Design a protein around this nucleic acid. Sequence first.
RNA 1: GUAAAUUUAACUGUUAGUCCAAAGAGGAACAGCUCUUUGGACACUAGGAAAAAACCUUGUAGAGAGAGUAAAAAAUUUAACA
Lengths: 161, 177, 100, 49, 40, 43, 55
Amino acid sequence: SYLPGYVPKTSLSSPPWPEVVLPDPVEETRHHAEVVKKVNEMIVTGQYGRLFAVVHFASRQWKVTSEDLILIGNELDLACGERIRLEKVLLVGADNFTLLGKPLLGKDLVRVEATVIEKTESWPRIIMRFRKRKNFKKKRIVTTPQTVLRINSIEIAPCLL
Amino acid sequence: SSFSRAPQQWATFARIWYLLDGKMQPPGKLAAMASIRLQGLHKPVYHALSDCGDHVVIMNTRHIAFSGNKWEQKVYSSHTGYPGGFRQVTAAQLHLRDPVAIVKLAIYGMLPKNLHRRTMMERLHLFPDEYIPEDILKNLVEELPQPRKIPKRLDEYTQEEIDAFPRLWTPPEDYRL
Amino acid sequence: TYSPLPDDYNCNVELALTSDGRTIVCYHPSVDIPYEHTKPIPRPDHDQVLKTRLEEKVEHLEEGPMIEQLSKMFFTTKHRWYPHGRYHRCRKNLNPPKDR
Amino acid sequence: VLADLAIYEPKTFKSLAALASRRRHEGFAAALGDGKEPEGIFSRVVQYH
Amino acid sequence: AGGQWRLQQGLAANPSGYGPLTELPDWSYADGRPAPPMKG
Amino acid sequence: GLDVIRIRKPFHTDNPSIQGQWHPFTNKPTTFRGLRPREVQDP
Amino acid sequence: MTGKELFEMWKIINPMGLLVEELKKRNVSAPESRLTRQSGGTTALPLYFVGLYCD
RNA sequence: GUAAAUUUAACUGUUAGUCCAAAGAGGAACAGCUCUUUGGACACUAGGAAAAAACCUUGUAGAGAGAGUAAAAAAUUUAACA
């Protein structure tokens, strides 16, 4: 009345974690198309307010939104006022939906534009190593070039489908 | 969320009151959960310099269960400061003298060893046996699940479950038992 | 069906890959609190020939008892309630930088 | 960024948690499988050349 | 994290190694003109 | 023209949150009739 | 007005009164106040969330 | 596979050895002890090992509110039927 591998229920008979059944691939593939279409219509009809995005810039990731300022830790060979496009968008998010790249979203889907508003240098950074000498007069001072970018806008296009 | 700045700040840093049941639970597992909540380490806004700890209420501290033989083996040692003032008592002896001492000491050790620790202890409310002051009961927001699953006793098993388990062996019919 | 996480709190999450498979789409609308899961707003609260008197409920308390009352009321230790000397008071920046 | 999202974008962070949980379950199913079955939808890796 | 898994997919163990995330241009001019190649 | 002094954060935003800043109830489920732990309905 | 919340610029008193008038113009029912969340109600530092419900 | 080597012209300073691993020779098959040899570390950095010259990881030149890693957490409870 039992299978060859039947084990009476006990504390260690089966794993403690609850068994999980994943959706059928065929059925799930259909559901994914409905979700992608629904989110696409929201973009088509402009059913979103403020947008935020995660951009990879200067070896760094920035969670930005429109009108934000980011202090880049180097010079960018650009004049103040120049308008550029931040082309590496890992994530763009809205109140009700989020788009994730694998790892980067396509240029067609999302456009993030920024402007250079200030080119400056950082405040003096002291470098002091305690070597076996009179250290004080041997303090090094470095200032690093910086660039301030203002995030002008984040635009999503209806290209999910 | 379109809240006003002052209300938004108040909600984010608001203190929450948590309830924990200590019946048949090991003190350390209770202490580990209380430690995290008392420090605010369960919040994404956590920062040590931010005083974002929460209130933890533990009931049934008298009914805690020690694994192994920790009741006899575990010794709590203190010194009055006078010559010959060293006192060593077992967990069982301490439990009878103060039903909340074991859970309190377990939490005290886990908290960071800094000046904020004694402030965190003020938000710890230990009660021996199911009675909580009405005022504290009105604060409670959430009850955290018990860390240890209490095994059922043999008498607590329903007849259906007893029948569902098979009889492994055939006892000799001539055995006294 | 199958949900990666419970959907009774915060938001309902629907995960969907695009046909090309290069983008992950997440639909997460807010979960409004059900009316049933709420409580009614608590309603707040004779030969009186003489006018009602606004008696001052301001009672003098000594430093020790006053600090003990403050510490109990806010669930803190007594130390923060004691004053500090001029050196630390003057050191504090009374025009600190403010970010939004 | 993930810490920033947890604080200021809880809905997006829950999605990321849901996505991680889904991928974790797909890994469990694959571990039980002998490889005869197909890989999970979210398991599929985009290749670059 | 994920260093061994990335190697199994033929990617660099560090996500800052080779691939679009690092090698592609960080920015371009708003009008569409390509930026000068980055120093790295 | 701003003072060349230490800048605390390398970013500034006046709108840090689009979906609502986290609070302790952001990820807590609601309960029927808002009953508290160990609270009795129909008191 | 970048970064400024509406009522920081437009100063109003008794918002509940203004809300009731605006809902009437829209034919919506009068809002009902309920306690969505509550914490530490009997303490010096309590937290309350109040939700307005129409129908 | 590498890029150093010798010679010539001048010139200066350092050099009173500690621990670890290995092989001997003396002590006691003691010492953070005596002597010699091979290699390593220590007056150049940092991470780890509880604090930590000598063990392990790593070499050392800046800025970053990015990332992948290295070393890196000690175990154990000891039979019997008549």
